[PDB]
């Protein structure tokens, strides 16, 4: 289950990264000063957003752009924490074997 | 196991920090405007990237530089979450002793 949800989180994260990159460009174009207006760097922004690396070179300036951003943040946070939860359940189970329980 | 994988994650993280610092300079040089072009600050960038401290003073501007960045992010995220998972298994085991189970 934990391994499945982890893999499910990864494939969902990828989808969100792709869709989020596409939706960002669509939302940002039309607003003067926006830098998130091309797909290649938008995808790079999506990775930055999901990981929270905080380079701060690219960010949305519109309402819907920021809404897309939030979805990517939470998706990244949920995913990277589901993996942590999956790794924990793995270690907990292995500990319950090296003690014979 | 949990303690081993934690130590394994730390030594791998260090390797990724070193290699990532070297690969970044190799990838960034040749691209006008790049600041990630010297090894000392590239190593500092690697630590920033793995921890996600988000100072935003240094970041790659090339495709392969960004690819190196992603590997460091995930390595840092995996490592710092494996340690969390290891600490959790430690506490869970100790709780199963103070209750006599």
């Amino acid at each position: 289950l934990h391994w499945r949800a982890a893999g499910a989180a990864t494939v969902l994260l990828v989808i969100v990264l792709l869709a989020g990159s596409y939706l960002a460009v669509l939302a940002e174009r039309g607003a003067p000063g926006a830098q998130l207006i091309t797909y290649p760097r938008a995808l790079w922004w999506s990775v930055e957003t999901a990981t929270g690396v905080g380079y701060g070179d690219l960010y949305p300036v519109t309402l819907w752009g920021r809404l897309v951003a939030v979805v990517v943040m939470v998706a990244g946070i949920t995913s990277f924490g589901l993996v942590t939860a999956a790794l924990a359940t793995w270690f907990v189970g292995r500990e319950q074997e090296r003690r014979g329980h | 196991l949990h303690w081993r994988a934690a130590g394994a994650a730390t030594v791998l993280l260090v390797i990724v920090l070193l290699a990532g610092s070297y690969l970044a300079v190799l990838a960034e040089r040749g691209a006008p405007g790049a600041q990630l072009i010297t090894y000392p600050r590239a190593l500092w960038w690697s630590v920033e990237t793995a921890t996600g401290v988000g100072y935003g003073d240094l970041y790659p501007v090339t495709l392969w530089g960004r690819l190196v960045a992603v590997v460091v992010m995930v390595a840092g995220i995996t490592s710092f979450g494996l340690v969390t998972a290891a600490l959790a298994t430690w506490f869970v085991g100790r709780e199963q002793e103070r209750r006599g189970h």
Partner: antibody, heavy 118, light 106 residues
Framework: QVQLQQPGAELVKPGASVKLSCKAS????????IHWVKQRPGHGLEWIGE????????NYNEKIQKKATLTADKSSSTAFMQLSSLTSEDSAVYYC???????????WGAGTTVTVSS | DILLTQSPAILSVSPGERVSFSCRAS??????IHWYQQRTNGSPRLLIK???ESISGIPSRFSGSGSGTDFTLSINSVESEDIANYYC?????????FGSGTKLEI
């Protein structure tokens, strides 16, 4: 093969309107944006607006008077530009261009010479 | 909006020499600049994308350099077919904008 096909010329009466077309061919991606550029005789290039056919979303130049309305047909792969209430100031060559969503205009149409007179 | 200044407006060069077109942005745009050529009665044609990247079908005597706010289009050994107007265009911030244009003269 020619990727963007525009009619050679369009004669318009002052006050009337005209609907320019831009039939496309070649590779088609959802990331494709169709742009329109105005060039008056002896002048330079002037970005009018853009549109993404796979959504119908359109953006326009805010620094100029809005004379244009962008639409597209996904089936016939044709982009449309509605110019309304035209004066002599609107007499120019109107180009259409295709952008892969990476910032540059790879291919241009031959351009439509729009003349506004009675 | 990003302002792109192309000075001078006209360049007079002798056959075989190396010429350089200038494009200055009103603010830092990295390397998000693109160069186009337009001959008489012709449509614009992409010469250089992202400051220095080459385009297929374009003669190798065309090159580009620069970053930030200062960009240069260079033609190596200018010949008669290079006689045209040259425009630069940025894609860093919305909306996209063009330079005033520079005419080559032999």
């Amino acid at each position: 093969q020619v990727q963007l096909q525009q009619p050679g010329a369009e004669l318009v009466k002052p006050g009337a309107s005209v609907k320019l077309s831009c039939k496309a061919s070649g590779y088609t991606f959802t990331s494709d944006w169709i742009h329109w550029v105005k060039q008056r005789p002896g002048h330079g290039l002037e970005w009018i607006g853009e549109i993404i056919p796979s959504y119908g979303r359109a953006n326009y130049n805010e620094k100029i008077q809005k004379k244009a309305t962008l639409t597209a047909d996904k089936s016939s792969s044709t982009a449309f530009m509605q110019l309304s209430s035209l004066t002599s100031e609107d007499s120019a060559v109107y180009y259409c261009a295709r952008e892969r969503g990476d910032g540059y205009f790879a291919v241009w149409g031959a351009g439509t010479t729009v003349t506004v007179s009675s | 909006d990003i302002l792109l200044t192309q000075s001078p407006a006209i360049l007079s060069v002798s056959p075989g020499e190396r010429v350089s077109f200038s494009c200055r942005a009103s603010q830092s745009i990295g390397t998000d600049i693109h160069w186009y050529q337009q001959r008489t009665n012709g449509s614009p044609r992409l010469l250089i994308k992202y400051a220095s990247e080459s385009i297929s079908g374009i003669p190798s005597r065309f090159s580009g350099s620069g970053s930030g706010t200062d960009f240069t289009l260079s033609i190596n050994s200018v010949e008669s077919e290079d006689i045209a107007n040259y425009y630069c265009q940025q894609s860093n911030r919305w909306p996209f904008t063009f330079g005033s244009g520079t005419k080559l003269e032999i």
